[PDB]
Amino acid sequence: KCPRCGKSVYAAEKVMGGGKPWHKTCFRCAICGKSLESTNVTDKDGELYCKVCYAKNF
Ligand SMILES: [Zn+2]
Ligand SMILES: [Zn+2]
């Protein structure tokens, strides 16, 4: 499930952040509001962050 929306996601939009399919829209980081193209995923405490914003913040 997409823990941001609370909505179950499956193979169609299944982009696995934290071992679970998120919405590709929410396969993002909420810092910038940027959706990530399938990859570019970095998990931090259950929250998804862009590899770009990761390099900026961390
Ligand atoms: Zn979502
Ligand atoms: Zn971001």
Backbone φ, ψ for residue 20 (5° rounding): -135, 145
Domain housing 6:
1-58
Residues with CB under 5 A from ligand 2 (ion): 29, 31-32, 34, 50, 53
CATH code of the domain in which 54 resides: 2.10.110.10
Inter-CA distances, 45 with 11, 17, 42, Å: 24, 11, 10
Q: Name the residue among 23, 29, 24, 16 with its Cα closest to residue 2.
A: 23
Angle 17-43-3 from CA coordinates, rounded to 5°: 50
Q: What is the C-alpha separation between 16 and 40, in angstroms, rounded? A: 11
Distance 56 CA to ligand 2 centre (A): 9
| Smallest-distance ligand from the CA of 13 | 1
E strand map for the chain: 15-17, 20-22, 28-29, 34-35, 41-44, 47-50
Number of domains comprising the chain: 1
> Under a CB-based contact definition with an 8 Å cutoff, are residues 27 and 36 in contact?
yes
Other Cβ atoms closer than 10 A to 34: 15
Q: What is the C-alpha separation between 51 and 32, in angstroms, rounded? A: 12
